[PDB]
Amino acid sequence: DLRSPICCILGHVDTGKTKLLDKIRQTNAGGITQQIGATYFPIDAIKAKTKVMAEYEKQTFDVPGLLVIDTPGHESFSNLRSRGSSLCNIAILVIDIMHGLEQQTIESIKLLRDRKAPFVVALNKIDRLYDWKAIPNNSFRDSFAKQSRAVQEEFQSRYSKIQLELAEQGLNSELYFQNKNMSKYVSIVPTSAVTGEGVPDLLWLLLELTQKRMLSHVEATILEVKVVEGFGTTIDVILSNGYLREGDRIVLCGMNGPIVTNIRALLTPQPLRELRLKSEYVHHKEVKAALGVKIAANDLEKAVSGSRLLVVGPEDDEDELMDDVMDDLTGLLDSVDTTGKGVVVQASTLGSLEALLDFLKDMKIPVMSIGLGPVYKRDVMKASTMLEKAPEYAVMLCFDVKVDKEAEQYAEQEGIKIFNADVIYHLFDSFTAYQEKLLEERRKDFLDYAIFPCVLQTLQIINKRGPMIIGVDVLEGTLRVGTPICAVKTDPTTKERQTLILGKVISLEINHQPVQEVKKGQTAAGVAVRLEDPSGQQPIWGRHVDENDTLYSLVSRRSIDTLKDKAFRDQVARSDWLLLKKLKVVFGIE
Template sequence: MIRQPIICVMGHVDHGKTTLLDKIRSTAIVAKEAGGITQHIGASEVPIEVIKKICSEMQNFSAESIKIPGLLFIDTPGHEAFTNLRRRGGSVADLAILVVDITKGFEPQTVEAIRILREYKTPFIVAANKIDMITGWINSKSKSLQTAMKQQNSQVIETLNKRVYEIVGKLGELGFSSDLYSNVTDFRQEISIVPVSAKTGEGVAELLMLATGLSQRFLEMKLNIEANGRGRGSILEKKEDRGLGFVIDVILYEGTLHVNDTIAFATSEGKVETTKIKALLKPKPLSEIRDSNSKFNYLDKVSAASGVRIGANNLDYAMPGSPVIQVVDDSYAKEISSEIGSVFATSKVGVILKADSIGSIEAISKLLDEQGVSISKKGIGNVSKRDVMDAFAMNAINPMDSIILAFNVGVDKDAEDAVFASSIKIIKSEIIYKLVDDCVATREGMKLNRAKAIEERITLPFQIEVLPHACFRASHPAIFGVRVVAGRVKLGAYAMSDEGVPVGKIRGIQNEKTPMTMAKANDEVAISMDEPTFGRQVKEGQMLYSKLSLEDIKMLQGEMAYLINDEEKELVKKIVGMGGGHKK
């Protein structure tokens, strides 16, 4: 059988995600939301009969050719539902609708959503919302954009086209080819932009037609499932129900689940638990799974694709984003552990990541990996004192890894105290891409500061020749003229003979009585040293070399190699050959 495609609605706060779904569902969910912003995760089924009715006035809509039973919409605040709709190799979502306020354009969570969709290789349609806010727009009372456009004047149409192509430009900057849906010729290669008004409903017909058509045309193989096969789903949310205790909201994307079936899932402690289903609650079509007043049907079985609430024992620690698998043999534990283990895989060194769900952990890990940032520890929940201690341990290995990333989680009081007493940085954000960008910027700043500090203390390679007839004082301090044959002489550097015998520390550099902090190749300067006596440890025509420490050599041949040119790199090798390289 062909199941319903699962569609995730994403976008920036207040761009109209829930209002758009509300218009499709004809329910009053939005009015009940705090501040009009989606606060919870939900799933709604829109039967194909409703879609046919909405699209009926469109001339190019062929109702007879539709095979899918409807659309299953996931309504999400930001990224959470999408990243929790996870399965090995990608997302449970078959398609996404990215809602963009046409009057504001791209905002931070818009970019975040696009980055995540690209990472999970999920096709999407752009719903350019709030066309009714365009000055002069006339409400046509129609669900069809085609009908609505016939009533608009040329100035409104020109403004609409301008706003659409601003979105085309922004998508182009992010590497996507896109166009107004009616101009798209290859739906596999181009993103379709559908102007809509979630308030008036104009454009909703085209949006549903496109979602239905694209799902059936390009995703039919993916939508074909074995109706009575093993039930598989993904936990969207865990909550406490007054009558049932802890329940989980699950998107079932494969097979069928029955009351009294045993299911397995992962807990926030990293264990695999099993439980027997006591109740399966499925909202009636066009009602919301999260609406406390919506009337759920108690069912004996539920088949994919569905948003279903499961009541059972031992759900207290069920982890959002975890797979839910019907237990039919002993393979469930290995399968779940393998999938969860891949998400929590870490490196020996790297930053520490704490987040609100496994979906967030996975999405952030993918984006950090793209930026070349390793993660040494991952976990769900608040930043703890143990996390701070672990980050402090990283400081000794690589200071740039002494960072804790906290996504949508708090910091325990004792952890705050530990941070205050250490050099550990905690970066917090509720936007995934901002967390990643802030991490990269912080590490880059730490790298520059570290490089600057090393540059100030590192000894550079030099070779100097003691000039004849240029001794100005024999000792305490010895002051004499030298020519820099190669390299650079820094104030405070130590010199040695060509046999590796220490000569002394350069305490002063002057050029015609003008103090200098550094002399470069071919400079002739006077230097002062406390330790040697001219004529004994230092003689005319003698070659002196920089006395490099083991740390200097390691740095100059490693991460600080950019400080020296090719000639100086050869000089380092020469100094090492003389027996240079001592512990500081």
């Protein structure tokens, strides 16, 4: 009697996903089990629910029952174990028949098609068919055969459209009973959360997709880390294999290293509604696989949601298991830049983190460090070290995490942008938008400060002042409008150095035409350079500067730095960096 299949149902509220789950549960007598963080369906109840399916299909019951996890968050969290551990044996994707594929549904598809996780689609809301005549809790095929051609038409249209919209997302799909290959195809089960129609179909199909196509070792997964009034910090877990017994020495991933503890309590909620003030929850000496269960213990405070859970055995070495649970994150931790400029990243679950990191890897946003849970001054201090080196990356990319008042108030002192939202977009738009806004400010400052190299030979002086106009040959580089031109003169002995700024280029004329720029080689003509007077006495031609003095764009330490950022991406040539090299020699810049 091996372990129950695990089913994750996810959908947006609008789709009716929560109403569907409620209708699935349907209490009205041992009772349906409302286990902590999951609902348990005993095979008996399943047979009872699916009796009506006998009309259409072979019924098989090779499993003890079924485990369903309602939450989209915990579907994110069931995706938190993710690639390393698959949490659900299958997913039930809910879509509104009236509305077709909606933004979120698109995402959920991509998400499932990422973990390679198998899924079925509940085409919900069929009760809203315009002339639908309801047969509560019936199988879909039976209700459908009893519907009018008007409804048969409407259904075919909406269905085959949604089928189409799915095709557009990469999915071949079919009504479940009509699919030649379950693989490389997606089953579609019409349902109504209102009348319960089609639920029987869905229940059947889950058993069929799990029992054949899909133990001593203990498989446990941390769904949630919660402070309980009488127990301090607890972990809510889903147990897929084996037993948990009170006193059991467990290991789990913590945000400050591997955590080892002993099970003080195994708790589930209380069957009596009346019992549960005095009773609270029930305590168990031991519990078997296929259930969702709260563990009380010491040292859980920094437990990481999404962690695998291990029971240390007689022959097992503790220190090697301490190694094992941490492995999922360790893989994640090693990817990061460490001592390299990058944005800091923080998340709620192991999966939320993996997802975010994977997404950023594809953008190619570098990542200095990663973290989990509540954001503190400690964590935002990691980002601090990027204010001078790479200010754009002076930001935290947080997903689904509370931030401290102290830490947010602290991130206000410095210039730390904290990004915090449920989905990437908000970060991606804020982050991307912030990065562009930063360039917007950077560009305005940079253009004045920035300066390309050029070396000019004066051919002859056209106008000595008012304004100075020089006829030149560009020897090296790019002479452009805005560029400040200067002479470098060393008194033979006394002065040992100099800078004589003649002006900034107003306009450039070659061959009777305005030009905005002249690169070495562009012409042979010689170019008249009109120079805007600099502030403070312009050197005097003949007296101070003359035909023989090679003149160059005025470059400086500041000039050179401003080239490196914002300017650098496309504008500079290698020839121009090489010229800069030589200019520093002339200007005495290190």
